Amino acid sequence: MNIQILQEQANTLRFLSADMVQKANSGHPGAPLGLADILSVLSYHLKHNPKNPTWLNRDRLVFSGGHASALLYSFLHLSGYDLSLEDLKNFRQLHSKTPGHPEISTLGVEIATGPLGQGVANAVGFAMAAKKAQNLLGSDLIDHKIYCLCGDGDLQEGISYEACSLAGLHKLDNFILIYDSNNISIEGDVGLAFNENVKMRFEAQGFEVLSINGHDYEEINKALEQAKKSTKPCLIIAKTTIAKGAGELEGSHKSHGAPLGEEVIKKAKEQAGFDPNISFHIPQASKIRFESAVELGDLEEAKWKDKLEKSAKKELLERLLNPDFNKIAYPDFKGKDLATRDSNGEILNVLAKNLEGFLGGSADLGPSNKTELHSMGDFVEGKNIHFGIREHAMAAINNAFARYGIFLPFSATFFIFSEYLKPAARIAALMKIKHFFIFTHDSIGVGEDGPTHQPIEQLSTFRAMPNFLTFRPADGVENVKAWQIALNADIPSAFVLSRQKLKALNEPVFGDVKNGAYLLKESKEAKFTLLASGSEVWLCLESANELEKQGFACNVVSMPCFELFEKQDKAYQERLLKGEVIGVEAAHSNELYKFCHKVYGIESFGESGKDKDVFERFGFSVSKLVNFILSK
Amino acid sequence: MNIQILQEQANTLRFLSADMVQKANSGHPGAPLGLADILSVLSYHLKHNPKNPTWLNRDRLVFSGGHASALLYSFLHLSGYDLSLEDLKNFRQLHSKTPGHPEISTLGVEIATGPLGQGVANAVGFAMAAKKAQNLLGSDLIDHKIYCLCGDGDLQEGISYEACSLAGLHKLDNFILIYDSNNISIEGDVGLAFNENVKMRFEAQGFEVLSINGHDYEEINKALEQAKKSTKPCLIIAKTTIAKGAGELEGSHKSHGAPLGEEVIKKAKEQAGFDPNISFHIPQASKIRFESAVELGDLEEAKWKDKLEKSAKKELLERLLNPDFNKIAYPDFKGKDLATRDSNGEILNVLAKNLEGFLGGSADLGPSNKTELHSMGDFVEGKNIHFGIREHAMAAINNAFARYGIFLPFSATFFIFSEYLKPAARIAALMKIKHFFIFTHDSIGVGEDGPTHQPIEQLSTFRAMPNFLTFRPADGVENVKAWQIALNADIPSAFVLSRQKLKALNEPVFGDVKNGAYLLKESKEAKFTLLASGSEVWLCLESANELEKQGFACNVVSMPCFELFEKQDKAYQERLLKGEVIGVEAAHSNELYKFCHKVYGIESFGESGKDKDVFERFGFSVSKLVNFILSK
């Protein structure tokens, strides 16, 4: 560790980064160049095994500014991860291992980032998950750091303030946030839009705050040493110059998100002692020094495994890594009329009791969501997490819990406020993580709180999002079967649940919940099929009885999951969907015309009133539905 | 102004509030009771005309905690607004003027609230809009205050931090935020989830901060006097007891959101000197004192109108209140190949030039959204607002600009990050305000930034949301026609625009953009119709040419707006949709099966690559589409 070697190392990172962006003719060179000194120093502090990116006690490194991806990739390559030099030359190209923003399919990447702010909240979540992991397994087995690199953009986003609020409350002294303060954003000078006292902000939220020159290697190093000893979450405010080293582009907003240009890169290389007429060059001293991470990380991981072998926590670690979902005896709700928020809360309790790594919480709505895990305690000693009124940060925190290595998290709010967390739900979907979203108060059935609290379009949003199952159970038995599927699935699930009591259904005639849609009633030479989910299934059963009394044969189909039904073969779909198919749901759900000739939904916003008065207004009654079906 | 009269007034507010919740058997009594002293005092300071709630220079009062609606309604009734005592007795009932959370259809309500945090950001927006209005009209005509009442829940939400950041930057010394600090939320003690140094937080964001007992009338009064003289945005931290006055329920989380109960209310009335055996009683002294707002507000408004009559700004105020959209000469883009982000930016420039009240901005993406209003200056002297990386607060700020009385705002970001502002977009829709949303980078056509930056489900979300038009123009001419409609509509609009160059279209054969979908190509005895929007229309035209060369008659339909097409009569729809209808869009857009037999979309997340490479991967080419259409 001297300035000559650190300068060479930083410059290696710069020029790989600049070269990759240039070859792609696409990407972000400014942040890589401005962060290269910091990352050079940090490489001396980071505990990780490049040959085993799943080591449980590794330091977790998050780049919140995912536009800095070339710098991440350069570092992974140089440190000995499975990412090659040819992969670097395929930056931002179709099917490469080096996409424009980081994806977890690239080994070494801790969490997908790209949408600003998410990373900061993910890093708090990794810090929380580490505290819980230490609670379970001991401080002899879990003692690592969480480092996050973030920029201006991250810290302007509301989710950053939400997550840092929590980091202070929970005294996350394993969390180190490094802010790249370069005074530049896409619109130019940061002062056009931001002039907060950042130190004061973060001190108000229980952080220790350091301020340094982010191009001074000894100051970077001293700050990391102090940060690692902090008794609070720590912020390093690192004043940098965007595109540091890039001559005429230093400090320019033009360096944020376009290639530096061939002549700029030649001049930069020249000034740094690099040969300007080659690219993708890795100097020898820098090669050896970065690659030393392989030997060092193998020995760190070895020492840890020896500690594990001595631990009384081995059998627990094995259960947490290999949960057995098949053994779980769920509640039997057959014939019981219940709100599905209540069936669901009973299931959450059964899960928490069977699965040592199953935990979660609500955004201040535990009592109403029915998500309290009874007699299981509060975080950190227990399992209930009190997120406060921070839907978005909750979901991003829980995305990190799902990535940590030993946890099965749930996030809960009212379905209408799913909108506050949807960007993080999207990241779960993109990553295909096991994170469960619990959304109660699913419809106009909410009643008196009125239209700001009555979902209308949210079912469409979640159905439309890739890599997500959206379950809307009609009763407790459906609610159990939705969970069985959700825990065995390869993608995240949402549970869309009622405030109000729903009527228990009879048993399936043909198919089941695993098929997405199934038959509850089947008639020969059916003239109509009524297809419904959740709270509307009983209406459809009553309506089909009235239509049969009036002389019309009907099928009734329960559709707890649209996405699973989309995967069924034509023969199955043809057996269910006979005659003229009518979809019925208390939502604005045009996607139902994939399967239905007519859809009886809600096209407007809701109304404040008693639940029964609001459903009648919106047409949800047997007499009205039957008149619709009979076109008169 | 003495303690006897203020006590009686506060208690009047309490017991109306408690009585309304009790009669409804639904609603939130805790906040009303805890805020009743503050609001009693504030009534002495508020400048407003109950008989003219549209007076432009009135103080704007926002209840961010919209669950406190009964207190708002009580105050509006007592002060002389058009809300009667019978309306109070119809709280939370279907079709009443007193819905569970406040709606702007109730005169006196400044902005709809209910989703927490929105109100705080709306109040910053009213403060910003007031500064701009003062810039335009003068400090002789605009000099009012903006008061916001908020709770724990509001200040935990990220949008609050975003909006307050801006309030400090812009030195909004017309903004007074009153925080009801009662240490209680739905999950119990606030310290379970929040322990920030609130004073330090807000000082970090450029506020002056006062701290008071919110049940001490002289302290409330002194703080309001000091706040009205502040040179910064001001926060009053008012320590209150939830359900103050309600005996055994004082300080209980159980008082947040359920009725207090008949016996509690009797004891409370008894302790306050009220007759316990009646309800909805308004004591005489309190009646006269609150109603004095009518005479006082008539004289305030009169004095203002005299100032206006003397002003050189009369003719401008009249133009701002009565814009003439019909006069506007838009750019002629016929035959010009352009990205629709670029056509759109040219239109934004034309609008800003013709409409003195048209302004807006981007969430740090002006250069990429193409939203800069050239030579029009920065806010406050000019029209370009630099929101920073604060999508949600931007939209909530702009909702308030749209409500202010003289402004036509736009908000802009990448379409993928519409998800960060969707809850405020929803409030625009609910209110039916004229607020325009500009969303560029609409598809996998984004290319290299990859799947976190490539919209897939967002078109579905916006189509599904009530009271919103979603325009996705295929060319600049469509882009102009979308604006003409948007400015004359009664609801908000979104503009979904491309990064990449689109090909100019020929003129309509039958119908036009105003019909939502129209014919570009029409063939007798058409076997197929290709229905598309935006970037996919050219693919469909090329494909229909190939299908005609292969001997199949085709129609081609451009669908710039799904919602307007849904409103067309059957005859129009039947003329367009001939044969087997195929919908084609670079989105996961199942709603297209409302009109299409087959849909050729994208069901997965995107990929990082060159735009041409990504569209080919996802099937968007003439050879692939034609093979799909021909089922082989």
Ligand SMILES: Cc1ncc(C[n+]2csc(CCOP(=O)(O)OP(=O)(O)O)c2C)c(N)n1
């Ligand atoms: C939620 C969100 N909104 C907008 C963007 C587009 N974007 C990328 S970086 C950036 C701002 C510049 O940010 P900064 O963090 O200062 O990065 P630097 O250029 O200094 O590296 C923006 C607005 C995004 N990725 N995420």
Ligand SMILES: Cc1ncc(C[n+]2csc(CCOP(=O)(O)OP(=O)(O)O)c2C)c(N)n1
């Ligand atoms: C965005 C959002 N998330 C959740 C809710 C549900 N909700 C209403 S009030 C409240 C919390 C209690 O808030 P506070 O502001 O402390 O109100 P108080 O009970 O003290 O009046 C919650 C979580 C909401 N209205 N908006």
Ligand SMILES: O=C[C@H](O)[C@H](O)[C@H](O)COP(=O)(O)O
């Ligand atoms: O503003 C949101 C409100 O607090 C809700 O009114 C309330 O918490 C819901 O109560 P319940 O569990 O009966 O639906």
Ligand SMILES: O=C[C@H](O)[C@H](O)[C@H](O)COP(=O)(O)O
């Ligand atoms: O992380 C988001 C990025 O900053 C975008 O890559 C960039 O700003 C887009 O540039 P362009 O105007 O060419 O699409």
Ligand SMILES: [Ca+2]
């Ligand atoms: Ca920056």
Ligand SMILES: [Ca+2]
């Ligand atoms: Ca509170």
